[PDB]
Coordinates of C-alpha atoms and ligand atoms in Angstrom, one line a residue:
Chain A
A2 CA 202.5 -9.2 40.7
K3 CA 199.3 -7.1 39.7
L4 CA 196.2 -6.4 41.4
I5 CA 192.7 -5.9 39.8
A6 CA 189.6 -4.4 41.9
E7 CA 186.0 -3.9 40.7
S8 CA 183.5 -2.2 42.9
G9 CA 179.7 -1.7 42.2
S10 CA 178.8 0.0 45.5
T11 CA 177.7 -3.3 47.2
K12 CA 180.8 -5.5 47.0
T13 CA 184.4 -5.0 45.9
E14 CA 186.1 -7.9 44.0
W15 CA 189.8 -8.0 44.5
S16 CA 191.9 -10.2 42.2
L17 CA 195.7 -10.7 42.9
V18 CA 197.0 -11.8 39.7
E19 CA 200.4 -12.9 38.0
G20 CA 200.1 -12.3 34.2
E21 CA 196.9 -14.2 33.5
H22 CA 196.9 -16.8 36.6
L23 CA 194.8 -15.7 39.5
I24 CA 196.7 -16.0 42.7
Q25 CA 194.0 -15.0 45.2
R26 CA 190.4 -13.7 45.2
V27 CA 188.8 -11.9 47.9
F28 CA 185.6 -9.9 48.3
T29 CA 185.2 -6.7 50.4
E30 CA 182.2 -4.2 50.9
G31 CA 181.4 -1.8 48.1
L32 CA 183.6 1.2 47.5
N33 CA 181.9 4.7 46.2
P34 CA 183.4 8.0 47.0
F35 CA 179.8 9.5 47.1
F36 CA 178.9 7.6 50.3
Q37 CA 182.5 7.4 51.8
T38 CA 185.2 9.6 52.8
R39 CA 189.0 9.0 52.2
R40 CA 189.3 7.7 55.6
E41 CA 186.3 5.4 55.3
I42 CA 187.5 3.8 52.1
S43 CA 191.1 3.3 53.8
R44 CA 189.4 1.6 56.7
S45 CA 187.1 -0.6 54.4
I46 CA 190.1 -1.8 52.2
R47 CA 192.4 -2.5 55.6
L48 CA 189.7 -4.4 57.4
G49 CA 188.4 -6.2 54.3
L50 CA 191.6 -7.6 52.8
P51 CA 194.1 -9.8 54.5
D52 CA 197.7 -8.8 55.3
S53 CA 198.9 -11.0 52.3
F54 CA 197.7 -8.3 50.1
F55 CA 199.6 -5.6 51.9
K56 CA 202.7 -7.8 52.0
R57 CA 203.1 -8.9 48.4
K58 CA 205.0 -6.5 45.9
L59 CA 202.7 -5.0 43.5
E60 CA 203.6 -3.2 40.3
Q61 CA 200.4 -1.7 39.5
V62 CA 196.9 -1.5 41.1
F63 CA 194.0 -1.3 38.9
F64 CA 190.7 -0.1 40.3
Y65 CA 187.4 0.2 38.9
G66 CA 184.5 1.6 41.0
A67 CA 181.1 3.2 41.0
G68 CA 181.3 6.9 42.0
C69 CA 184.6 7.6 40.3
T70 CA 183.4 10.0 37.9
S71 CA 185.1 13.2 38.3
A72 CA 188.8 14.0 39.0
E73 CA 188.2 14.9 42.7
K74 CA 186.5 11.7 43.2
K75 CA 189.2 9.7 41.4
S76 CA 191.8 11.3 43.7
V77 CA 189.9 10.1 46.9
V78 CA 190.2 6.3 45.7
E79 CA 193.8 6.7 44.2
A80 CA 195.2 8.2 47.3
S81 CA 193.7 5.6 49.5
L82 CA 195.1 2.9 47.4
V83 CA 198.5 4.4 47.2
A84 CA 198.5 4.9 50.9
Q85 CA 197.7 1.2 51.5
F86 CA 199.7 -0.4 48.7
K87 CA 202.3 1.9 48.3
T88 CA 202.0 1.4 44.5
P89 CA 200.9 3.4 41.6
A90 CA 197.1 3.0 41.3
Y91 CA 195.0 3.8 38.3
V92 CA 191.3 4.6 39.4
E93 CA 188.8 4.4 36.6
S94 CA 184.9 4.0 36.3
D95 CA 183.5 0.4 36.8
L96 CA 181.9 1.0 33.3
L97 CA 185.5 0.9 32.0
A98 CA 185.8 -2.5 33.8
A99 CA 182.7 -3.7 31.9
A100 CA 184.0 -2.2 28.7
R101 CA 187.3 -4.0 28.8
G102 CA 185.9 -7.1 30.4
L103 CA 183.3 -7.8 27.8
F104 CA 185.0 -6.4 24.7
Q105 CA 188.7 -6.2 25.2
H106 CA 189.8 -4.5 21.9
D107 CA 186.4 -5.0 20.1
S108 CA 183.7 -2.5 19.4
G109 CA 180.3 -2.4 20.9
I110 CA 177.9 -1.5 23.9
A111 CA 178.7 -2.3 27.5
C112 CA 176.1 -2.2 30.0
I113 CA 176.0 -2.6 33.9
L114 CA 172.8 -3.8 35.9
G115 CA 173.7 -4.2 39.3
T116 CA 173.6 -1.8 42.6
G117 CA 173.5 0.8 39.8
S118 CA 173.1 1.0 36.1
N119 CA 175.5 2.4 33.4
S120 CA 176.0 2.2 29.6
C121 CA 178.6 3.2 27.1
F122 CA 179.8 3.0 23.5
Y123 CA 183.3 1.4 23.4
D124 CA 185.4 1.6 20.1
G125 CA 188.1 -0.9 21.4
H126 CA 190.3 1.5 23.4
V127 CA 188.0 4.3 24.9
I128 CA 184.5 5.2 25.7
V129 CA 183.4 7.3 22.8
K130 CA 179.7 7.8 24.1
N131 CA 178.5 7.5 27.9
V132 CA 174.9 8.2 29.1
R133 CA 175.5 9.5 32.7
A134 CA 174.5 6.9 35.3
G135 CA 173.2 9.7 37.7
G136 CA 173.2 7.5 40.9
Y137 CA 170.3 5.8 42.6
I138 CA 168.3 8.9 42.7
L139 CA 168.6 10.8 39.7
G140 CA 169.2 7.6 37.7
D141 CA 170.3 3.9 37.6
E142 CA 167.3 2.8 35.7
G143 CA 166.6 -1.0 35.6
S144 CA 169.2 -1.4 38.6
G145 CA 168.6 -3.2 41.9
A146 CA 168.6 0.1 43.6
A147 CA 165.7 1.2 41.3
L148 CA 163.9 -2.1 41.9
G149 CA 164.0 -1.7 45.9
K150 CA 162.9 2.0 45.5
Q151 CA 159.9 1.1 43.4
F152 CA 159.3 -2.0 45.7
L153 CA 159.5 -0.2 49.0
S154 CA 157.3 2.7 47.8
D155 CA 154.6 0.3 47.1
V156 CA 155.1 -1.5 50.5
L157 CA 154.7 1.9 52.2
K158 CA 151.6 2.8 50.1
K159 CA 150.2 -0.8 50.4
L160 CA 150.2 -1.2 46.5
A161 CA 152.4 -4.2 46.6
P162 CA 150.8 -7.7 47.3
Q163 CA 150.3 -8.7 50.9
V164 CA 152.5 -11.7 50.6
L165 CA 155.5 -9.6 49.6
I166 CA 154.6 -7.0 52.5
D167 CA 154.4 -9.7 55.2
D168 CA 157.4 -11.5 53.9
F169 CA 159.6 -8.3 53.5
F170 CA 158.8 -7.3 57.2
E171 CA 159.5 -10.7 58.6
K172 CA 162.7 -11.3 56.6
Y173 CA 164.5 -7.9 57.5
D174 CA 162.5 -7.6 60.8
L175 CA 161.4 -4.0 59.9
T176 CA 158.4 -1.7 60.4
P177 CA 157.5 1.0 57.9
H178 CA 158.9 3.6 60.3
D179 CA 162.1 1.4 60.3
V180 CA 162.2 1.3 56.5
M181 CA 162.0 5.1 56.5
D182 CA 165.0 5.3 59.0
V183 CA 167.3 3.0 56.9
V184 CA 166.9 4.8 53.7
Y185 CA 167.0 8.5 55.1
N186 CA 168.8 8.4 58.3
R187 CA 171.4 5.2 57.8
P188 CA 174.3 5.2 55.4
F189 CA 174.7 3.4 52.1
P190 CA 170.8 3.4 51.2
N191 CA 171.7 2.3 47.8
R192 CA 173.1 -0.8 49.1
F193 CA 169.5 -1.7 51.1
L194 CA 167.4 -0.6 47.8
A195 CA 169.8 -2.9 45.7
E196 CA 169.4 -5.7 48.4
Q197 CA 165.8 -6.0 47.5
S198 CA 166.9 -7.3 44.0
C199 CA 167.8 -10.5 45.8
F200 CA 164.6 -10.7 47.9
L201 CA 162.3 -10.2 45.0
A202 CA 164.2 -12.8 42.8
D203 CA 162.4 -15.7 44.5
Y204 CA 158.8 -14.2 43.9
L205 CA 159.1 -14.3 40.1
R206 CA 155.9 -16.2 40.1
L207 CA 153.9 -13.0 40.9
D208 CA 152.5 -10.9 38.4
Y209 CA 153.6 -7.8 40.3
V210 CA 157.2 -8.9 40.4
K211 CA 157.4 -9.7 36.7
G212 CA 155.7 -6.3 36.2
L213 CA 158.2 -4.7 38.4
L214 CA 161.5 -6.2 36.7
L215 CA 160.2 -5.6 32.9
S216 CA 159.0 -1.9 33.5
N217 CA 162.2 -1.1 35.2
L218 CA 164.5 -3.1 32.3
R219 CA 162.4 -1.3 29.6
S220 CA 163.1 2.1 31.4
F221 CA 166.8 1.4 31.1
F222 CA 166.9 0.7 27.4
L223 CA 164.4 3.6 26.8
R224 CA 166.8 6.0 28.5
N225 CA 170.2 4.6 28.0
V226 CA 170.6 1.8 25.4
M227 CA 168.2 3.8 23.0
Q228 CA 170.7 6.8 22.6
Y229 CA 173.4 4.6 21.0
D230 CA 173.7 3.0 17.8
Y231 CA 172.0 -0.3 19.2
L232 CA 170.9 -1.9 16.0
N233 CA 174.3 -2.3 14.5
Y234 CA 176.4 -2.9 17.6
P235 CA 176.7 -5.9 20.1
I236 CA 175.2 -5.2 23.5
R237 CA 176.8 -7.3 26.3
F238 CA 175.5 -7.0 30.2
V239 CA 177.3 -7.3 33.2
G240 CA 176.1 -7.1 36.8
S241 CA 174.0 -9.2 39.6
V242 CA 170.6 -7.8 38.2
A243 CA 171.4 -8.7 34.8
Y244 CA 172.6 -12.2 35.8
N245 CA 169.9 -13.1 38.0
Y246 CA 167.1 -11.7 35.8
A247 CA 168.8 -13.0 32.6
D248 CA 165.5 -14.3 31.0
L249 CA 163.7 -11.1 31.6
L250 CA 166.7 -8.9 30.2
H251 CA 166.7 -11.1 27.1
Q252 CA 162.8 -10.7 26.7
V253 CA 163.3 -6.9 26.9
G254 CA 166.2 -7.0 24.4
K255 CA 163.8 -8.8 21.9
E256 CA 161.1 -6.1 22.5
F257 CA 163.7 -3.5 21.4
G258 CA 164.8 -5.7 18.6
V259 CA 168.3 -6.7 19.7
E260 CA 169.8 -10.1 20.5
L261 CA 171.4 -10.2 24.0
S262 CA 174.0 -12.9 24.1
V263 CA 176.5 -12.1 26.7
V264 CA 175.4 -11.6 30.1
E265 CA 178.4 -12.0 32.7
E266 CA 177.7 -11.7 36.6
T267 CA 181.2 -10.0 36.9
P268 CA 183.5 -8.3 34.4
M269 CA 186.6 -9.3 36.4
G270 CA 187.1 -12.6 34.2
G271 CA 187.8 -10.4 31.2
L272 CA 189.8 -8.0 33.1
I273 CA 192.4 -10.4 34.1
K274 CA 192.5 -11.4 30.3
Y275 CA 192.9 -7.8 29.5
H276 CA 195.6 -7.0 31.8
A277 CA 197.8 -9.8 30.4
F278 CA 199.5 -7.5 28.2
Chain B
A2 CA 148.4 34.9 73.0
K3 CA 149.5 31.5 71.4
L4 CA 151.8 30.4 68.6
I5 CA 150.9 28.5 65.5
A6 CA 153.7 27.1 63.3
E7 CA 153.7 25.1 60.1
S8 CA 156.7 23.7 58.4
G9 CA 156.9 21.8 55.2
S10 CA 160.7 20.9 55.0
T11 CA 161.6 24.2 53.1
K12 CA 160.2 27.0 55.1
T13 CA 158.3 27.1 58.6
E14 CA 155.5 29.9 58.9
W15 CA 155.2 31.4 62.5
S16 CA 151.6 33.1 63.5
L17 CA 151.6 34.9 66.8
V18 CA 147.8 35.2 67.3
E19 CA 145.5 36.2 70.0
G20 CA 142.0 34.4 69.2
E21 CA 142.1 35.1 65.5
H22 CA 143.7 38.3 65.4
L23 CA 147.5 38.1 63.9
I24 CA 149.8 40.2 65.7
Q25 CA 153.1 39.0 64.1
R26 CA 154.0 36.7 61.1
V27 CA 157.6 35.5 60.3
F28 CA 159.0 32.9 57.8
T29 CA 162.3 30.7 58.8
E30 CA 164.0 27.8 57.3
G31 CA 162.0 24.4 57.1
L32 CA 162.2 22.1 60.2
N33 CA 162.3 18.2 59.5
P34 CA 163.5 15.8 62.1
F35 CA 164.6 13.4 59.3
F36 CA 167.0 16.0 58.2
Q37 CA 167.8 17.8 61.3
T38 CA 168.8 16.8 64.9
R39 CA 167.3 18.2 68.1
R40 CA 170.1 20.7 68.4
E41 CA 170.0 21.8 64.8
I42 CA 166.2 22.5 65.4
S43 CA 166.8 24.4 68.5
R44 CA 169.4 26.5 66.9
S45 CA 167.0 27.1 63.8
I46 CA 164.3 28.5 66.2
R47 CA 166.5 30.5 68.5
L48 CA 168.5 32.5 65.7
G49 CA 165.5 32.3 63.3
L50 CA 162.8 33.9 65.2
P51 CA 162.9 37.6 66.3
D52 CA 163.3 38.4 69.9
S53 CA 159.8 39.3 69.9
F54 CA 158.8 35.7 70.1
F55 CA 160.7 35.0 73.0
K56 CA 160.1 37.9 75.3
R57 CA 156.2 37.5 74.8
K58 CA 154.5 35.1 77.2
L59 CA 152.9 32.0 75.3
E60 CA 150.0 30.0 76.5
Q61 CA 150.2 26.8 74.1
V62 CA 152.7 26.2 71.0
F63 CA 150.8 24.5 68.0
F64 CA 153.4 23.1 65.5
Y65 CA 152.6 21.0 62.4
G66 CA 155.7 20.0 60.6
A67 CA 156.9 17.4 58.0
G68 CA 158.7 14.5 59.2
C69 CA 156.8 14.5 62.3
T70 CA 155.7 10.7 61.7
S71 CA 156.3 8.6 64.9
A72 CA 155.8 9.9 68.5
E73 CA 159.9 9.5 68.4
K74 CA 160.4 12.1 65.8
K75 CA 157.6 14.5 67.2
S76 CA 159.6 14.3 70.5
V77 CA 162.5 15.6 68.8
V78 CA 160.6 18.9 67.8
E79 CA 158.7 18.9 71.0
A80 CA 161.9 19.0 73.1
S81 CA 163.1 22.0 71.0
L82 CA 160.0 24.2 71.5
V83 CA 159.7 23.7 75.2
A84 CA 163.5 24.6 75.6
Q85 CA 162.9 27.8 73.6
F86 CA 159.3 28.7 74.6
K87 CA 159.1 27.5 78.2
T88 CA 155.4 26.5 77.5
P89 CA 153.7 23.0 76.6
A90 CA 154.0 22.5 72.8
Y91 CA 151.9 20.2 70.7
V92 CA 153.7 18.6 67.8
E93 CA 151.8 17.1 65.1
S94 CA 152.0 16.3 61.3
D95 CA 151.7 19.1 58.6
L96 CA 148.9 16.7 57.0
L97 CA 146.9 17.4 60.2
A98 CA 147.4 21.2 59.5
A99 CA 146.1 20.5 56.0
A100 CA 143.0 18.9 57.3
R101 CA 142.1 21.2 60.1
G102 CA 143.1 24.0 57.9
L103 CA 140.9 23.3 55.0
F104 CA 138.0 21.4 56.4
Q105 CA 137.7 22.7 60.2
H106 CA 135.3 20.2 61.4
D107 CA 133.9 18.9 58.1
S108 CA 134.6 15.7 56.4
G109 CA 136.7 15.3 53.3
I110 CA 140.2 14.5 51.9
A111 CA 143.0 17.0 52.6
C112 CA 146.2 16.8 50.3
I113 CA 149.4 18.5 50.4
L114 CA 151.5 19.4 47.2
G115 CA 154.5 21.3 48.3
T116 CA 158.0 20.2 48.8
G117 CA 156.6 16.8 49.7
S118 CA 153.2 15.3 49.1
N119 CA 150.6 13.8 51.7
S120 CA 147.1 12.6 51.8
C121 CA 144.4 11.7 54.3
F122 CA 140.7 11.2 55.0
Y123 CA 139.5 13.9 57.6
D124 CA 136.2 13.1 59.4
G125 CA 136.1 16.4 61.1
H126 CA 137.9 15.2 64.4
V127 CA 141.0 13.0 63.6
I128 CA 142.6 11.4 60.6
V129 CA 140.6 8.3 59.6
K130 CA 143.0 6.9 56.9
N131 CA 146.6 7.9 56.0
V132 CA 148.3 6.9 52.7
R133 CA 152.1 7.1 53.8
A134 CA 154.0 9.9 52.2
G135 CA 157.2 8.0 52.1
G136 CA 159.5 10.8 51.9
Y137 CA 161.0 12.5 48.9
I138 CA 162.9 9.2 47.9
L139 CA 160.1 6.6 48.5
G140 CA 157.2 8.8 47.7
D141 CA 156.0 12.3 47.3
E142 CA 154.3 11.8 44.0
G143 CA 153.3 15.2 42.4
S144 CA 155.4 17.0 44.8
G145 CA 158.1 19.6 44.0
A146 CA 160.9 17.2 44.9
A147 CA 159.2 14.7 42.6
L148 CA 159.3 17.2 39.7
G149 CA 163.0 18.2 40.3
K150 CA 164.0 14.6 40.9
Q151 CA 162.5 13.7 37.4
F152 CA 163.8 16.9 35.6
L153 CA 167.4 16.8 36.8
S154 CA 167.2 13.1 35.9
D155 CA 166.4 13.8 32.3
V156 CA 168.9 16.7 32.3
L157 CA 171.7 14.4 33.1
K158 CA 170.4 11.6 30.6
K159 CA 170.4 14.5 27.9
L160 CA 166.5 13.7 27.5
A161 CA 165.3 17.2 28.6
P162 CA 164.9 20.2 26.1
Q163 CA 168.2 21.8 25.5
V164 CA 166.9 25.1 26.2
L165 CA 166.1 23.8 29.7
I166 CA 169.4 22.0 30.2
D167 CA 171.3 25.2 29.3
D168 CA 169.3 27.6 31.4
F169 CA 169.5 25.3 34.6
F170 CA 173.3 25.2 34.4
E171 CA 173.4 28.8 33.6
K172 CA 171.2 29.7 36.7
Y173 CA 173.2 27.8 39.2
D174 CA 176.6 27.7 37.5
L175 CA 176.9 24.1 37.9
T176 CA 178.3 21.1 35.8
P177 CA 176.8 17.5 35.7
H178 CA 179.3 16.6 38.4
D179 CA 178.5 19.4 40.4
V180 CA 174.7 18.5 40.4
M181 CA 175.8 15.0 41.6
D182 CA 177.3 16.5 44.6
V183 CA 174.5 18.8 45.6
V184 CA 171.9 15.9 45.6
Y185 CA 174.2 13.2 47.1
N186 CA 176.8 14.9 49.3
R187 CA 175.3 18.3 50.2
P188 CA 172.6 18.6 52.8
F189 CA 169.0 19.3 52.3
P190 CA 168.8 17.6 48.8
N191 CA 165.0 17.4 48.9
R192 CA 164.9 21.3 49.1
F193 CA 167.1 21.8 46.0
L194 CA 164.8 19.2 44.0
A195 CA 161.7 21.0 45.1
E196 CA 163.3 24.3 44.2
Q197 CA 163.3 23.1 40.4
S198 CA 159.6 23.3 40.7
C199 CA 159.7 27.2 40.9
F200 CA 162.3 26.9 37.9
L201 CA 160.1 25.0 35.5
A202 CA 157.1 27.3 36.3
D203 CA 158.6 29.9 33.8
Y204 CA 158.7 27.3 30.8
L205 CA 154.9 26.2 31.2
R206 CA 154.7 26.8 27.4
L207 CA 157.0 23.8 26.6
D208 CA 155.0 20.6 26.0
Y209 CA 157.8 18.7 28.2
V210 CA 157.0 20.7 31.3
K211 CA 153.0 20.4 30.8
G212 CA 153.8 16.6 30.1
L213 CA 156.1 16.5 33.2
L214 CA 153.5 18.1 35.5
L215 CA 150.5 16.2 34.2
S216 CA 152.6 13.0 34.5
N217 CA 153.4 13.6 38.4
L218 CA 150.1 15.2 39.4
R219 CA 148.2 12.0 38.1
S220 CA 150.6 9.9 39.6
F221 CA 149.7 11.2 43.0
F222 CA 145.9 10.8 42.4
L223 CA 146.5 7.1 41.2
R224 CA 148.7 6.1 44.2
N225 CA 147.2 8.3 47.2
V226 CA 143.9 10.0 46.4
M227 CA 142.3 6.9 44.8
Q228 CA 142.9 4.9 48.0
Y229 CA 140.0 6.9 49.6
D230 CA 136.3 7.3 48.7
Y231 CA 137.3 10.3 46.7
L232 CA 134.2 10.4 44.4
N233 CA 131.9 10.9 47.4
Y234 CA 133.8 13.3 49.4
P235 CA 135.3 16.9 48.8
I236 CA 139.1 17.0 48.0
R237 CA 141.0 20.1 49.0
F238 CA 144.6 20.9 48.2
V239 CA 147.2 23.1 50.0
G240 CA 150.9 23.7 49.1
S241 CA 153.3 25.6 46.7
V242 CA 153.1 23.2 44.0
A243 CA 149.3 22.9 44.3
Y244 CA 149.0 26.8 44.2
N245 CA 151.4 27.5 41.2
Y246 CA 150.0 24.7 39.1
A247 CA 146.4 25.1 40.1
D248 CA 145.1 25.2 36.4
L249 CA 146.8 21.6 35.6
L250 CA 145.8 20.1 39.0
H251 CA 142.2 21.2 38.4
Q252 CA 142.7 19.5 34.9
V253 CA 143.7 16.3 36.5
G254 CA 140.8 16.6 38.9
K255 CA 138.4 16.7 36.2
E256 CA 140.0 13.7 34.6
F257 CA 139.4 11.7 37.5
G258 CA 135.8 13.1 37.8
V259 CA 136.3 15.4 41.0
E260 CA 135.7 19.1 41.3
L261 CA 138.9 20.6 42.9
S262 CA 137.7 24.1 43.8
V263 CA 139.6 24.9 47.2
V264 CA 143.4 25.2 46.4
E265 CA 145.3 27.1 49.2
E266 CA 149.0 28.3 49.3
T267 CA 149.3 27.8 53.0
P268 CA 146.9 26.1 55.5
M269 CA 147.7 28.8 58.1
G270 CA 144.7 31.0 57.5
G271 CA 142.5 28.0 58.4
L272 CA 144.8 27.2 61.5
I273 CA 144.3 30.7 62.8
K274 CA 140.4 30.3 62.3
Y275 CA 140.6 26.7 63.8
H276 CA 142.4 27.6 67.2
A277 CA 139.9 30.1 68.8
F278 CA 137.6 27.7 70.6
Ligands
LIG1 C1 177.7 8.4 41.3 C2 177.3 6.9 41.2 O1 177.1 6.4 42.3 N1 177.1 6.5 39.9 C3 177.3 5.0 39.6 C4 178.1 4.7 38.3 O2 179.4 5.4 38.6 C5 180.2 6.2 37.6 C6 181.5 6.2 37.9 C7 179.3 7.3 37.0 O3 179.0 8.1 38.0 O4 179.2 7.4 35.9 C8 178.2 3.3 38.1 O5 178.9 3.1 36.8 C9 176.9 2.8 38.0 C10 176.9 1.2 38.0 O6 177.4 0.5 39.1 O7 176.2 3.1 39.3 C11 176.1 4.4 39.5 O8 175.1 4.6 40.6
LIG2 C1 159.3 12.0 56.3 C2 158.8 13.1 55.4 O1 159.7 14.0 54.9 N1 157.5 13.0 55.1 C3 156.8 14.3 54.6 C4 155.4 14.2 55.3 O2 155.6 14.4 56.7 C5 154.6 13.6 57.5 C6 155.0 13.9 58.9 C7 154.7 11.8 56.9 O3 155.8 11.6 56.6 O4 153.8 11.5 57.4 C8 154.6 15.6 54.9 O5 153.3 15.4 55.3 C9 154.7 15.6 53.3 C10 154.1 16.9 52.8 O6 154.8 18.1 53.3 O7 156.0 15.6 52.8 C11 156.7 14.4 53.2 O8 157.9 14.3 52.6

């Protein structure tokens, strides 16, 4: 048996598979070594997963997570996985999951639009070019975190519509002071900012929300997608933001003169197909 | 004798005064209750200040600091001051220091452009309207933290001039991965981002830098200043970024049709004048 895990910072998708047949699917909280220590990751995995995962004999454990950028960061997750599963674990970027999941052994451009945002050029085996994500502060354009950051900024400065302001404070039972506390004082701020993508998904009628989405989606293209040879290679998307705003993403694509066809919610479906050889 | 202190997240200016005569002035590190606990601030004051401040008997303590949003946050700083000085302390926002320091008892609009950015309408007694700063993440347009946040974003995205990228990494001896840790893992990220404002001041000849300054300075006016009756009231700036980029700030001022003639480095000179009667 093999285990494939895909994390994006908000949720971690676990797939216990046999060849190509899925045995069990479980979701835990997101795993990111920029926001979690080795102890916190180990706790998350053990609390999140049933005992059935830690009982079944595993040959390899394939992990793809956000934050797994450097060797030091990949060591944190790996040592945590090895501790729990007693199995050689291969920790890679969630961007490689997006690449393998969307293309298998084909060439093109794989992108992520979820909690964070990332992009790469895939030749069919390895990532040739990769514009750095930068995290929720120094990047992640067109991501849920970027949407929420822009939204909450407008909420605090009363530049968003009143209906949105009132509905936000009612739904989350917060005050401006509390919003300040969650972002700066409470952990996983990137989750809370990204969580606002789900909130604003119901207000697609408002001009503000359309303007918020488009401007962020365009910002992703201009800074990430534009850097690649995008006019000659297929561009495929993965992520919650991509999936929920598939119409607006396709619109932005057409603005930059590209035809976005494949928009998957999770790259996991293709990862099982990929890890079947 | 009484003590006037002014903090802006990066540094704290201390003025020991009798009436309007300065006895001693010392700088320490910045005090922000969003980034520091009560025990951290107490240690910063105790070790930071000379033995001259503690042996001298004080009448009142006037403290204005960033992060002193609610009464809850002010109490943190207040408890620290009383524990050190053993004299009633008055903890307010640094925005009120800007208002009292620039206008005294006159009506107008006081603005801060330092590590963070803040704005208000001062009627000569109290702050009437206050557009929330939002902090370095959810606001602070045209601030030092905004400049650095945008610059380092471009650095990682390989969208900034190569001359700036190379000089940045050479100055700090950092790699892309290292910069990621300084912002996300290592404390006082807002300080490091704002410090990049000092860096970009050398390269004011580059079109990129001029374009980056003007972009942020306008964003401050658009989102903060223009919420007030700005065409019928004097606007006066204070802060390190305001002082350093006084030429470009005055440029933005004339573009919006206001005469920015008062730009100060610190509002301390006015606070010494204020606290006399
Ligand atoms: C440090 C951090 O959080 N970055 C992550 C990315 O992680 C990879 C490993 C990277 O750093 O390149 C991730 O691909 C995207 C999409 O989820 O979101 C970003 O926020
Ligand atoms: C939470 C925080 O850091 N905010 C501060 C402001 O603090 C006041 C108290 C406020 O938030 O109203 C400060 O005036 C400006 C300018 O220095 O910078 C912001 O970043």
